[PDB]
Design an enzyme around this catalytic site. Structure first.
Site: not given
Ligand code: HEM
Ligand SMILES: [Ca+2]
Ligand SMILES: [Cl-]
Length: 595
Positions: A105, A108, A110, A184, A186, A188, A190, A258, A351
């Site tokens: 997370q 992600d 970042d 960003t 990268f 990094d 951020s 979150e 998730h």
């Molecule tokens: C609550 C949420 C989490 C934990 C209790 C959780 C956890 C993760 C992990 C462990 C991820 C990667 C290994 C991961 C990736 C991405 N998430 Fe997710 N996440 C929780 C809740 C959310 C919510 C709400 C969103 C938004 C989804 C939407 O479309 O409304 C969410 C997104 C993402 C996401 C996309 C990020 C982006 O570029 O918008 C991951 C790559 N997660 N989460």
């Molecule tokens: Ca970044």
């Protein structure tokens, strides 16, 4: 034609060629094409957007326009019939700690964030997308199927607003709608410092000349710093316990609060900054703040890159790592460093790694207090459980000694996220992360499963038996095609995540291909990657290679026993060692003399 122009929600930034640190925004990392990788630009397309009208309207919008000849199944029906499960026994991964889920997370957040359109604030449109469940413009509500328990207790939909997109934001027409990345591309750090320079300055203590990061002045953790509060309301962290009225934390990422372990991880990273900043000052007392900030900001960056590429990605990708992420051969400035739109869904494999409870562990790693263990859903936008009930050390202990959820073909997403997600703007613990992800794939015009199998040069099954063979699951394959009718229609998120896991990893072939390819790009496309010659001295780089999440904890908590490999399943006390055993990050090689 060459619509390379499109991009007028952006100033564009004159680049000071010689500058020895990164921009906050990610601009100027690439010299020929400076906008590449930088925040507030479009997510790269690895394949053309696929919209109901080939422009912007998502599949499932019009109760009438099919996909390949079939209706798309309601997002929530897919969630209910495939993603859901009841029995939390037997679900925990016997070889990945909770830190495994948590670092995913971190990394992600970042790399990618497509926020919703914030036009609809100063507007009722929020409230009657909510109540009336009336689909229009950027209100794309999630309708409940027949016999859905939420029909009884929550009305007809859970609300849902479309992702922000480039050039316009309200008005007409698209080359084809491309969603924005607000951070960003990268790796990094951020999420620690910010991707807009506004917020970046706001996170800094400019009072001192020490280029420290701002800390909480209201409250402290046995002396150790907390993040500063976001002092602007509404606060969804106030909303969840008004008695406590403890607001959300302010970090360089919007989503830091979150859930209580993300804010925990954020708090370890902040302390690591200030730890690094005020240790450099001892070593190099002449350096002003701007050089303490940037030179500590440069080391935090590389720490994240090492832990990710040395310890995380290897145990995610497994057999497939060496095929996608072979040894560093140097910066290729012809590499696209941008995060792709599909990656933001491939990385949502996280998730299914989130378990239904979080524990708090004392100094002997035993249940801390009488509510040591709490349901995950009570920990969304929960900052008070840290400030007014023990600090982070009890929470970081659970991260080390509790297990990730093992992804499971008939136990995919805990009810804690599938039914009891809290959204910042709304008022219930009543949402479905899984149905959200499926709705979002369509909102982003995602190609179907077979397009992406095609993309990665894997079989494109067209039959029930073709799909049984791939998912290696007669029942899952039956359930999916009962809903979608063709593997061509299966939403990429549930497609990728339905495949069994590649060996010594936690994703199937399709996701390993998509993920591997993106991290390959994030490394090779970065001018400021820590192994890229010039960025660091040889002496710095041998002193950086000994970093550990174990180390980070020892130095930024009052915890004294830590595992030597914080991502595998570690039981106390056998797999735990004293802190005088790990290997410190030695900053002798960072000594500026004079002239
Ligand atoms: C609550 C949420 C989490 C934990 C209790 C959780 C956890 C993760 C992990 C462990 C991820 C990667 C290994 C991961 C990736 C991405 N998430 Fe997710 N996440 C929780 C809740 C959310 C919510 C709400 C969103 C938004 C989804 C939407 O479309 O409304 C969410 C997104 C993402 C996401 C996309 C990020 C982006 O570029 O918008 C991951 C790559 N997660 N989460
Ligand atoms: Ca970044
Ligand atoms: Cl894409």
């Amino acid at each position: 034609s060459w619509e390379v122009g499109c991009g007028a929600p952006v100033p564009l930034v004159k680049c000071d060629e010689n500058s020895p640190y990164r921009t906050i925004t990610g601009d100027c990392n690439n010299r020929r094409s400076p906008a590449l990788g930088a925040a507030n630009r479009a997510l790269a397309r690895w394949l053309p957007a696929e919209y109901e009208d080939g422009l912007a309207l998502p599949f499932g919008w019009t109760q009438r326009k099919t996909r390949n000849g079939f209706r798309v199944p309601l997002a929530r029906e897919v969630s209910n019939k495939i993603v859901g499960y009841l029995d939390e026994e037997g679900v925990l991964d016997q070889n990945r700690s909770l830190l495994f889920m948590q670092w995913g997370q971190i990394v992600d957040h970042d790399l990618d964030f497509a926020p919703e359109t914030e036009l609809g604030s100063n507007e009722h449109s929020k409230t009657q997308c909510e109540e009336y469940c009336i689909q229009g413009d950027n209100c794309f509500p999630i309708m409940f199927p027949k016999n859905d328990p939420k029909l009884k207790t929550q009305g007809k939909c859970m609300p849902f607003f479309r992702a922000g997109f480039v050039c316009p934001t309200p008005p007409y027409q698209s080359l084809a709608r491309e969603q924005i990345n607000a951070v960003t591309s990268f790796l990094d750090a951020s999420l620690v410092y910010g991707s807009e320079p506004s917020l970046a300055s706001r996170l800094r203590n400019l009072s001192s000349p020490l280029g420290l990061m701002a800390v909480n002045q209201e409250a402290w953790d046995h002396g150790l710093a907390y993040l500063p509060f976001n002092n602007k309301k509404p606060s969804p962290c106030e909303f969840i316990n008004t008695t406590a009225r403890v607001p959300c934390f302010l970090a360089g990422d919007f989503r830091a609060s979150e859930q209580i372990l993300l804010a925990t991880a954020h708090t370890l990273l902040l302390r690591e900054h200030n730890r690094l900043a005020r240790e450099l000052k001892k070593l190099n007392p002449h350096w002003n703040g701007e050089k303490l900030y940037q030179e500590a900001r440069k080391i935090l960056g590389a720490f994240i890159q090492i832990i990710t590429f040395r310890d995380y990605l290897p145990i995610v990708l497994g057999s497939e790592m060496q095929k996608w992420i072979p040894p560093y051969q140097g910066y290729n400035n012809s590499v696209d460093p941008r995060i792709s739109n599909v990656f933001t869904f491939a990385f949502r494999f996280g998730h299914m790694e989130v378990p239904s409870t979080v524990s708090r562990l004392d100094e002997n790693y035993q249940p801390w207090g009488p509510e040591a263990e709490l349901p995950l859903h009570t920990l969304f936008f929960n900052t008070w459980r840290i400030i007014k009930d023990g600090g982070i050390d009890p929470l970081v202990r659970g991260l080390l000694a509790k297990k990730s959820k093992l992804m499971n073909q008939d136990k995919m997403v805990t009810s804690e996220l599938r039914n009891k997600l809290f959204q910042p703007t709304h008022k219930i613990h009543g949402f479905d992360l899984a149905a959200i992800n499926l709705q979002r794939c369509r909102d982003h015009g995602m190609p179907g499963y077979n397009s992406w199998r095609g993309f990665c040069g894997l079989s494109q099954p067209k039959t029930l038996k073709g799909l049984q063979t791939v998912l290696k699951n007669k029942i899952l394959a039956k359930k999916l095609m009962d809903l979608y009718k063709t593997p061509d229609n299966i939403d990429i998120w549930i497609g990728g995540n339905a495949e069994p896991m590649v060996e010594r990893g936690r994703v199937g072939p399709l996701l390993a291909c998509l993920l591997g390819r993106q991290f390959q790009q994030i490394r090779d496309g970065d001018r400021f990657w820590w192994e890229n010659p010039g960025v660091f001295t040889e002496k710095q780089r041998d002193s950086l290679q000994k970093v550990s999440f174990s180390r980070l904890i020892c130095d930024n908590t009052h915890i004294t026993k830590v595992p030597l490999h914080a991502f595998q399943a570690n039981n106390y006390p056998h797999d735990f060692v004293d802190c005088s055993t790990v290997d410190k990050l030695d900053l002798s090689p960072w000594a500026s003399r004079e002239n």
